Amino acid sequence: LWHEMWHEGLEEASRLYFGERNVKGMFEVLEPLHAMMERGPQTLKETSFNQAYGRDLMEAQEWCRKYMKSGNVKDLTQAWDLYYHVFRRISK
């Protein structure tokens, strides 16, 4: 379910950012997903997901948090490289 939630969430978040140019909408999708990671995994599958992708997703969040302070779109570009790398691996 974590793999399903992130796969669908990253897709919708990317549509809001790249398609609609809507950063607010992007963050609304991603925030709850990062928040559930912070609370921690509750099952074996969530723990395995966290093992594979947790570090990269946390770094993606830190670049988004950097954007909240800088206003610099470049910081979102860094976030999206990490998010896309995670997205590709979940698809495989």
Spatial separation of the C-alpha atoms in residues 45 and 51, rounded to whole Å: 10
Resolution of this structure in Å: 1.8
Any residues with CB less than 8 A from the CB of 45 and at least 6 apart, and which? 1, 2, 3
Spatial separation of the C-alpha atoms in residues 17 and 1, rounded to whole Å: 24
Spatial separation of the C-alpha atoms in residues 50 and 44, rounded to whole Å: 10
DSSP string, 43-83: SHHHHHHHHHHHHHHHHHHHHHHHHHHH--HHHHHHHHHHH
CATH number of domain containing 65 = 1.20.120.150
Q: Within a 10 A sphere around the Cβ of 65, how many other Cβ atoms?
A: 13
How far is C-alpha 42 from the geometric centre of its chain's CA atoms? 19
Spatial separation of the C-alpha atoms in residues 10 and 6, rounded to whole Å: 6
How many distinct structural domains can be found in the chain?
Answer: 1
Residue 82 φ then ψ, to 5°: -65, -45
* Residue-range definition of the domain harbouring residue 58: 1-92
- Please give the span between the terminal C-alpha atoms of the chain, in angstroms, as a whole number: 16
For 85, half-sphere exposure in the C-beta direction (CA atoms, 13 angstrom radius) is: 14
Q: Within a 10 A sphere around the Cβ of 66, how many other Cβ atoms?
A: 15
